[PDB]
């Protein structure tokens, strides 16, 4: 419909095709470095605190 | 290129036929009223036309001349002009073709967007349905405001009245009601779809434009008609806009569908009628309003019926909006319309500024249908809420013992529960969840300044984690024992976890 309602159908076709080809990025888990903390907890909870308790 | 082609397409089809038509000469034109001489066979309240394509209504049939009111501007009509009778009582287009279109009081498209494809016309001045066609109001009209759906419920075929001062939140209630119907209109069953009509009388064009864009943003013009007779439209148009809109809704209710119409305001239709009547020289009455000022409204609000299943089963709800002066509900038009309508919704500025929004004065607001036209879950919960607020309002003017202290606590918790924002109507099951949480002593622990935070967070949590429970409540339409136990555990868990 839209390209049927525009004069320079070529330009809108170009935008449509560029949209189709081009995608968007996605973040990562670098800010999830807190992964490390979990292991540390295993020490107090399961190794240290558990044992002396 | 094709622009001129489509331009020609219009000329290609024209009106060749010239007929021998009766006429009359304008003896005197001034203030919007013409006194035609001739038109010996013109009917009463018939539509006539002027030499410049401008319409009018023959309202007065005196022996020597016909008093005609011009549906438009008056500078273009001269003396000795020509008035041709169209031989048809005033009527307007009707049909689903009008949905999503802004039209003027006479059914002319006002937003561009081409013409109306209506295949049928209906007379504005039609008699109300008799006593036999109707049937008691059964279904609920879901408004989305907690305080209206719980404490002053509205059925389909009822005629509520939204009465208050200027800038207390009346049009806001109207728009919330219009927007809420989106969930039902998007669904599949046609027994819940409700087509909305908004008659804007005397409102400046900027206000109606804001309203129309607000409806478009909420994607609510798929099923809304807007009949705008704004301030700059001659009085004969603001007088007739309510009747045009009511005919557009009469079509729906007569074709088995459901419609909702919102006259906004009727206190300005009364003023336009008074101006017309005073310029036709009819003697004034009390406050200068004509004698037939009650009739004006009673014949209009009596068309909001609830047809029985033999006449289609369709319905037409009405929500007239009145505007009082400094809360003087005792005025003339307010009292007329209060004695015409079924329910009322009193908005008060003292409540608007005290933080209670919508300002609905639950103490005075009434609804004759009451019990009927309320879902079973809401009926169960809002009853206890109503009793609790009724008791609270008695002992409220002050602020000891545990029993009355807890009574005040519960009343205040419920009060802050009923507040709401703008253009965010709630599904009925969500309202039931919130009111159930509030009324079952759960919020009595929380502070009253944090109740809004709870309400909001609880809604956001339930709408995602417990969509299944809300679907159950909606489908079964009651708080069953298992549903009650669930609700109990969800609320108990959430309260502590917050």
């Amino acid at each position: 419909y839209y390209k049927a309602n525009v004069a320079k159908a070529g330009l809108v076709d170009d935008f449509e095709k560029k949209f189709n080809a081009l995608k968007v990025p996605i973040p990562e888990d670098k800010y999830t470095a807190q992964v490390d903390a979990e292991e540390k907890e295993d020490v107090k909870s399961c190794a240290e605190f558990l044992t002396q308790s | 290129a094709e622009v001129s082609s489509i331009l020609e397409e219009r000329i290609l089809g024209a009106d060749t036929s010239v007929d021998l038509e009766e006429t009359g000469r304008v003896l005197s034109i001034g203030d919007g009223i013409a006194r035609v001489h001739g038109l010996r066979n013109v009917q009463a309240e018939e539509m006539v036309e002027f030499s410049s394509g401008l319409k009018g209504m023959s309202l007065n049939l005196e022996p020597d001349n016909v008093g005609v009111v011009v549906f438009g501007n008056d500078k273009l009509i001269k003396e000795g002009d020509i008035v041709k009778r169209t031989g048809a009582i005033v009527d307007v287009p009707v049909g689903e073709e009008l949905l999503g279109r802004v039209v003027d009081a006479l059914g002319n498209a006002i937003d561009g967007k081409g013409p109306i494809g209506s295949k049928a016309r209906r007379r504005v001045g039609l008699k109300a349905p008799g006593i036999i066609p109707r049937i008691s109001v059964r279904e609920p009209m879901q408004t989305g405001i907690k305080a209206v759906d719980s404490l002053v419920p509205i059925g389909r075929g009822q005629r509520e009245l939204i009465i208050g001062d200027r800038q207390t939140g009346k049009t806001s209630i109207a728009i919330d009601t219009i927007i809420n119907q989106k969930r039902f209109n998007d669904g599949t069953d046609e027994k819940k779809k409700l087509y909305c009509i908004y008659v804007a009388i005397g409102q400046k064009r900027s206000t109606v434009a804001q309203l129309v864009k607000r409806l478009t943003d909420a994607d609510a013009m798929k099923y809304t008609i807007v009949v705008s007779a704004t301030a700059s439209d001659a009085a004969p148009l603001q007088y007739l806009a309510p009747y045009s809109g009511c005919s557009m809704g009469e079509y729906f209710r007569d074709n088995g569908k459901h419609a909702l119409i919102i006259y906004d305001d009727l206190s300005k239709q009364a003023v336009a009628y008074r101006q017309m009547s005073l310029l036709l020289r009819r003697p004034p009455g009390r406050e200068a309003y004509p004698g037939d000022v009650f009739y004006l409204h009673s014949r209009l609000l009596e068309r909001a019926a609830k047809m029985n299943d033999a006449f289609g089963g369709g319905s037409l709800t009405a929500l007239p909006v009145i505007e009082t002066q400094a809360g003087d509900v005792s005025a003339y038009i307010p009292t007329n319309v209060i004695s015409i309508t079924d329910g009322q919704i009193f908005l008060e500025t003292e409540l608007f500024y005290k933080g209670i929004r919508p300002a609905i004065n639950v103490g005075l607001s009434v609804s004759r249908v009451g019990s009927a036209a309320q879902t079973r879950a809401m009926k169960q919960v809002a009853g206890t809420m109503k009793l609790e607020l009724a008791q609270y309002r008695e002992v409220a003017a002050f602020a000891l013992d545990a029993a009355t202290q807890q009574l005040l606590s519960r009343g205040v918790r419920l009060t802050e529960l009923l507040k709401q924002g703008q253009y965010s109507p709630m599904a009925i099951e969500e309202q039931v969840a919130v009111i159930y949480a509030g009324v079952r002593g759960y919020l009595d622990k929380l502070e009253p300044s944090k109740i809004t935070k709870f309400e909001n967070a609880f809604l956001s949590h339930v709408i995602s984690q417990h969509q299944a429970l809300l679907s159950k409540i909606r489908t079964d339409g009651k708080i069953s024992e298992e549903s009650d136990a669930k609700l109990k555990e969800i609320v108990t868990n959430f309260l502590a976890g917050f």
Binding site: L22, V24, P25, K30 | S4, L7, I11, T16
Partner: protein, 62 residues
């Protein structure tokens, strides 16, 4: 239908305009002044982005 001399007259004037529409005839300076004014207003209301193609993003992670 071939009798409404003004019907065919209007059609004839329309045809002549169609033929003569190489450039807006009788445009006058008002044509350009308006065109510019409302194009400018639309440009403001929409935006000042790169009015040929897709602007790029370069988003930022949390």
């Amino acid at each position: 239908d071939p009798v409404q001399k003004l019907f065919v007259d209007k059609i004839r004037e329309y045809r002549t305009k169609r033929q003569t529409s190489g450039g807006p005839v009788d445009a006058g300076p008002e044509y350009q002044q308006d065109l510019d004014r409302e194009l400018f207003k639309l440009k403001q209301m929409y935006g000042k982005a790169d009015m040929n193609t897709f602007p790029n993003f370069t988003f930022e992670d949390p």
